[PDB]
Design a protein around this ligand. Structure first.
Ligand SMILES: COC(=O)c1cc(O)c2cc(NC(=O)NCCCCNC(=N)NCC[C@H]3O[C@@H](n4cnc5c(N)ncnc54)[C@H](O)[C@@H]3O)ccc2c1
Ligand SMILES: COC(=O)c1cc(O)c2cc(NC(=O)NCCCCNC(=N)NCC[C@H]3O[C@@H](n4cnc5c(N)ncnc54)[C@H](O)[C@@H]3O)ccc2c1
Lengths: 330, 336
C-alpha cells in the first residue's frame, strides 16, 4: 500500500507519459492495433487499464467503441479527463480514478486495452493489474489488446561494451599515456555486477538466431498464479561466427488480434523506449561459428520488492560447464 | 550521513565509469594536457602534488612536462589502478601514487606546484575545492604554482530550444495521432519548470538570449579564499536580450585558466554553451514559467552559489532577478 501509492504517483509527472507517447514505434503500434480491430470493437464496451493521459481510450472510441472506461490510479487521471473533454468524447469515454483492482465499473466490458509492459516485459509488473481486471470485469472470451506477449533471448556481442572496454587501449593515441592495463578493471566493473542493464543494441550485436522462450496469452485464466512463481523457459542456439560472447539480451513483443499486428522491441526492429534487457556474463567468453549455447531464463518478482524484476539465468557455452547468474533490475 | 555520503563517493570513484567519462571528455583532458605542458618552465625539475589523481593521467602529464617528482594522491580504490598506470608507463620512480584523502596524506616534502581537476557541476557542487585549498596551505611552497590558477563563473539568460519542444509537444499530438492534447501544456510547464532543482543539461549558442556575463572569479592562490566559499560565491549581472523569444531562465557555467609561462597567452578550459561540449554541460535555472521578452529587454539580478544547509557538498543557488518592467522575483535552487 505504501509501495502501490509510491508506484502510482511516479506516473503523476509529465515526463514518463511524454516518453511513452513520444515513442512512435509504441504509440503507432497501439494506434494501429486498436483501429485494426474496428470490427470487433464496434459498438462494444472497453476498459483501458491504466489509461494515463487517456490517449489509448480515444483510439478505442475512434475504432467505434460505444463506451470506454478509462481507469487510472495516479493524479494524471485529471489530465485525461480534460483530454477526453477537449476531444468531445465525455459522453462515451469515462475517466474513473483509482486502482483498477477496486474501481467500480457500471458493467462488465467486451474488451480490455492496456499498455502495461515494463523493462524486460515484467519490471513494474502491471500485468497482474491487467489480469485482475480481466477476471473481474472482462466478459467470457473477451478481447484483450494486446492479446499476448512473446519473450525472446539472443546471445550477444555488445559493440558498445567492446568500445568501452577497449577505450583504455586507445588513450595512448589520444594523449600519449598508456592505459591498456585498466582493461580488466573495466571488465570487472561493467560485467561483474548482477544488475539487469537496459540498453539499445542493434542487429550487429546479435550472436545467434533469437529464440522464443515463453509466450503469455492474456486471455488464459489462472495466468496470475504463474507470474508470482516465474515465467520463462528453455532455449538453445548456435553462434553466427567468431566474437567475444558478452551474455544475453532479453526482449519481448506484443501481438494484437488480427481483425496480426506485432509491437516488437527486438534489436533487429526499430528502437523503442524499452530497448532490451542485457544479462552480462562476468567476463567475455570467446565463441566461434556453430558454438552451441543452451540455457534457461526465468522472470520473477524480487523477494524484497514485488514490482522489481529479477531474472534467473542458467547457461552453457559449448563444453565450458553449466553456469548460473542471478539478475535484478537497478 | 557523512559516512553514507563518503561510502557512496568512494564506491563511485572506485568504479571505472566516472573515470571513463572524465578521460573521454577530450576538451577537458586535452586542456589539462596543454595547460600542464605549457608550464614546463615552471615544472622542469620541480615537485608536484596532484590532488585527486584518479587514474594518474594528470600526474603523468606533469612528469612528461619535466617534473622531477609527482605525488599523486587519490582517496578512492582507483588509486590501485593509477599505480598500475604509472608503472606501465615506466614512471613509478618519479610519480608516487599515495592512497587516501589529501587532508591526511604525509608528503616527504612540500611541493613547487599543485595540479588538480576538482570542478563539479555548476563549478561547486560536490566540490573538491576545499581539498585543493587545504593542500595549497599545507603542502605548497611560498609562491608555488597552481594548475589551473583560477576559475570564472558566467551567467546568461536562455531560451532552451529543447525545453520549448517538450513544452509544445502536447500541442503537436493531434497533427500526429488525431488526439488533441494541448490542454497538457500548462501541466507540463509546472512539471518541467515549476520545481526548484538545478538541471544539468547541454545547451547550444542558439539557446543564449544575451551576452554572457561573468559574475565571479576564484583565484586559487589567495589565502583566506576559504571564507568566501562558505558565505557565498556570487555576483550581480545585467544584460539586454538579443531578440524575441520566451525566456526560460538562466544557464550557469564556468571556465578555469592555466598560467601562460612560455607563451604568455592564458589557456582556458571552457564549459560555455558557445564552446565545445564537456561533461559538465551547464547548470540550468528555470523560471516557474516562460516569460516573453523582445530585443533589448533588460534583465538584471544577483546569483549566489551557496552550500545547502542539510549538506555542505550539495550546491544551492539563490537567484534574484528582474525582467524588464516586471517586479523583481527570487527563486531558490538546489542540485538534485
Ligand atoms: C530523471 O529521471 C530519470 O533519470 C528516469 C529514469 C528512468 O528509469 C525512467 C524510466 C521511464 N520509463 C518508465 O517509467 N516506464 C516504461 C515502461 C513502464 C511500464 N508501465 C507502463 N506500461 N505504463 C503505463 C502505466 C499507467 O497505468 C497506471 N496504472 C498502473 N497500475 C495501475 C492500476 N493498478 N490501476 C490503474 N492504473 C494503473 C500508471 O499510473 C500509468 O499511468 C521513464 C522515465 C525515466 C526517467
Ligand atoms: C578513505 O577515503 C574514503 O573513504 C573517501 C572519503 C571521502 O570523503 C570521499 C569523497 C569523495 N568526493 C569527491 O570526490 N567529490 C568530488 C565530486 C566532483 C569533483 N570531482 C572531480 N572534478 N574530480 C575527481 C578527481 C578524484 O579526486 C578524488 N578525491 C576527491 N576528494 C579527494 C580528497 N579529499 N583527497 C584525495 N582524493 C580526493 C576522487 O576520488 C576522484 O577520483 C570521493 C571519494 C571519497 C572517499
Amino acid at each position: 500500500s505504501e509501495r502501490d501509492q509510491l508506484y502510482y504517483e511516479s506516473y503523476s509527472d509529465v515526463s514518463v507519459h511524454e516518453e511513452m507517447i513520444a515513442d512512435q514505434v509504441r504509440t503507432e503500434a497501439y494506434r494501429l492495433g486498436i483501429l485494426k480491430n474496428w470490427a470487433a470493437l464496434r459498438g462494444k464496451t472497453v476498459l483501458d487499464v491504466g489509461a494515463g493521459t487517456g490517449i489509448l481510450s480515444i483510439f478505442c472510441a475512434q475504432a467505434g467503441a460505444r463506451r470506454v472506461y478509462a481507469v487510472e490510479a495516479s493524479a494524471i487521471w485529471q489530465q485525461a479527463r480534460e483530454v477526453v473533454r477537449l476531444n468531445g468524447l465525455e459522453d462515451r469515454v469515462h475517466v474513473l480514478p483509482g486502482p483498477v483492482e477496486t474501481v467500480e465499473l457500471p458493467e462488465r466490458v467486451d474488451a480490455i486495452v492496456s499498455e502495461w509492459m515494463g523493462y524486460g516485459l515484467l519490471h513494474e509488473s502491471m500485468l497482474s493489474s491487467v489480469l485482475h481486471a480481466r477476471t473481474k470485469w472482462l466478459k467470457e472470451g473477451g478481447l484483450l489488446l494486446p492479446a499476448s506477449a512473446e519473450l525472446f533471448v539472443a546471445p550477444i556481442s555488445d559493440q558498445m561494451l567492446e568500445w568501452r572496454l577497449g577505450f583504455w587501449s586507445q588513450v595512448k593515441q589520444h594523449y600519449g599515456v598508456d592505459m591498456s592495463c585498466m582493461e580488466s578493471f573495466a571488465t570487472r566493473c561493467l560485467m561483474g555486477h548482477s544488475e539487469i542493464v537496459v540498453q539499445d543494441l542493434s542487429g550487429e550485436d546479435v550472436l545467434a538466431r533469437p529464440q522464443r522462450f515463453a509466450q503469455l496469452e492474456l486471455a488464459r485464466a489462472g495466468l496470475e498464479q504463474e507470474l508470482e512463481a516465474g515465467v520463462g523457459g528453455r532455449f538453445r542456439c548456435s553462434c553466427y561466427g567468431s566474437a567475444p560472447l558478452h551474455g544475453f539480451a532479453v526482449w519481448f513483443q506484443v501481438t494484437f488480434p488480427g481483425g496480426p499486428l506485432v509491437l516488437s522491441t527486438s534489436p533487429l526492429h526499430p528502437a523503442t523506449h524499452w530497448k532490451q534487457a542485457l544479462l552480462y556474463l562476468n567476463e567475455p567468453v570467446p565463441v566461434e561459428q556453430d558454438t552451441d549455447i543452451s540455457g534457461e531464463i526465468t522472470l520473477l518478482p524480487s523477494p524484497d520488492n514485488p514490482r522489481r524484476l529479477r531474472i534467473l539465468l542458467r547457461y552453457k557455452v559449448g563444453d565450458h560447464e553449466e553456469k548460473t547468474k542471478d539478475f535484478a533490475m537497478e
